[PDB]
RNA sequence: GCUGCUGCUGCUGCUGCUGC
RNA sequence: GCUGCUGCUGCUGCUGCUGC
């Protein structure tokens, strides 16, 4: 039935060979990138997305939705009732989850934007 | 079986009468306060606390728990196994959960701190 | 990195009761 | 505001399998 996603890039989730690789190279603390997802109602979109914690690659992520791409992949799902919606994002072991109704929904993106921010920028 | 919480300010949950005058007074943008919590393991500390959007006010309650007092209960419950930690807040209708092993409390508080401050400044 | 599952706190949305 | 529950995605920690 595919779906419209939020997001605003395409999945880069690194193959069993890749990860493997990755590993025998280098911790936890420098992982090839980091995960994150949107949920409205009971659908979730994903994504993997390679980050190595400069510059121009946090500006390159912090990129891959925005609030006006958020409402058009939620607003698929929406009617009289509220439902649920969900950001997560989980880097070098944490997690970060920010929920709430869909009457929300601007505020949520707001607090998740800011989120992937200082989670991204977390000092080793 | 007593025990230590992570928090330095004592409950502050409104009586179901103050709640209603509340309620006659004024909207779910101005309610008496927030509610956050720290969960170790299986043992939960709730605390609700009252906020009125100025400076004083959020300068009161980002005292309401630190890294180290968040450690010397979080320690409490650790050994050799890692458990599962996670800090929650909800304001105007937001949800922010921070979790992650017992390996990286120190992580989790950090961003645990930097979510709280942004939602209560949440502009609304 | 992924799919699948077992045990174990918590979270969103909805639903109803307490005083309640 | 609170206690208790019903249905419904998701999250932490632990556990094992996939290629896997
Ligand atoms: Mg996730
Ligand atoms: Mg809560």
């Known amino acids: 039935s595919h779906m419209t996603s939020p997001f605003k890039l395409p999945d880069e989730s690194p193959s ?13 603390d420098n992982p090839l990138g980091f995960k994150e997802s949107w949920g409205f109602g009971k659908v979730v979109f994903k994504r993997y997305l390679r980050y190595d914690r400069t510059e121009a690659s946090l500006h390159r992520v912090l990129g891959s939705w925005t609030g006006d791409s958020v409402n058009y992949a939620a607003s698929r799902f929406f ?7 969900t950001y997560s994002i989980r880097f070098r072991g944490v997690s970060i989850t920010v929920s709430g109704g869909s009457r929300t929904l601007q505020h949520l993106c707001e607090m998740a934007i800011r989120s992937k921010q200082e989670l991204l920028q977390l000092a080793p």
């Open 79 to 85: 009617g009289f009732d509220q439902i649920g919606c």
């Open 16 to 28: 069993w060979t890749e990860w493997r690789l990755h590993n025998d190279e280098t911790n936890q």
